[PDB]
């Protein structure tokens, strides 16, 4: 859950690969797309509640 | 004769310059870790909730 620790976006999973004197991580993340506009409210009022 | 006296200065000044350059490497390795912590705090406290 650490932001940016395992790639950009919401981390899903990672896979390691070996390199000559190092390691390559393949990070799979979720990136939200195609946002729409809406009107919001904090609470609803119904029956005086 | 001035060769023998110039070499005594050259040796000293080289020693002093190289001491300066070692202590800067050791001080930069410490500034680097602080900046690496600042970069993690910017990710985890400013662009998220930790
Ligand atoms: C949600 O609505 C806002 C405001 O209506 C949109 O903001 C527009 O942004 C563009 C930038 O290219 C401005 O030129 C417009 O003046 C803004 N207002 C408009 C178009 O009414 C925003 O784009 C909307 N978001 C989505 C995802 O559609």
Swiss-Prot record, chain B:
Subunit of the fusion protein that is processed upon entry into the host cell. Mediates fusion of the virion and cellular membranes by functioning as a class I viral fusion protein. Contains a viral fusion peptide that is unmasked after S2 cleavage. This cleavage can occur at the cell membrane by host TMPRSS2 or during endocytosis by host CSTL. In either case, this triggers an extensive and irreversible conformational change that leads to fusion of the viral envelope with the cellular cytoplasmic membrane, releasing viral genomic RNA into the host cell cytoplasm. This is Spike protein S2'. The lineage of its organism: Viruses, Riboviria, Orthornavirae, Pisuviricota, Pisoniviricetes. The gene is S.
